[PDB]
């Protein structure tokens, strides 16, 4: 528990996962100006969809959680 599960369901598990999450998100930053341009564009469309379709806010939160899930997984 103390030198075990409490460390993994606690600070140590957070350190492992968040470092992995941080490195996977940073992989998107290729400094390719054409790629950032597409990123701005997809972000633009997502904002347009959320407001135009009067989307359920729960959908947006589910989408964000899903995106963290994917960035949990490498490659």
């Amino acid at each position: 528990l103390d030198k075990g599960s409490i460390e993994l369901f606690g600070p140590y598990g957070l350190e492992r996962g968040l470092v992995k999450l941080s490195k996977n998100i940073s992989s998107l930053s290729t400094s390719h100006v054409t790629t950032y341009a597409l990123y701005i564009l997809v972000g633009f469309i997502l904002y347009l969809i959320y407001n135009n379709l009067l989307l359920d806010y729960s959908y947006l939160l589910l989408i964000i959680i899903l995106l963290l899930l994917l960035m949990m997984i490498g490659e």
Binding site: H32, V33, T34, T35, A37, L41
Partner: protein, 87 residues
């Protein structure tokens, strides 16, 4: 409606483009012309000279911005030798 299609074409320039940053400038110019085209037709429908005046200032600003961007690209090409992203 033509202005809408033209704005799409300029938008699609970024979507279809991974390596050609010169096409990036051109897409910005198509979008600016598309938006100016829309203002001009609307001000003709609403009988308003202010819309034409707005178009003239966008043309001036778009011309001045093309000047700066071509200048920045030249300062970039002088040290690099390519305008191509190795993608």
């Amino acid at each position: 409606n033509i202005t809408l299609i033209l704005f799409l074409i300029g938008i699609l320039g970024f979507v279809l483009n991974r390596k050609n940053i010169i096409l990036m400038l051109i897409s910005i110019e198509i979008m600016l012309l598309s938006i100016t085209f829309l203002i001009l037709l609307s001000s003709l429908n609403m009988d308003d000279i202010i819309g034409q005046t707005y178009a003239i200032y966008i043309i001036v600003v778009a011309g001045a911005e093309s000047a700066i961007g071509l200048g920045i690209l030249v300062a970039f090409y002088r040290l690099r030798g390519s305008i191509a992203i190795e993608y």
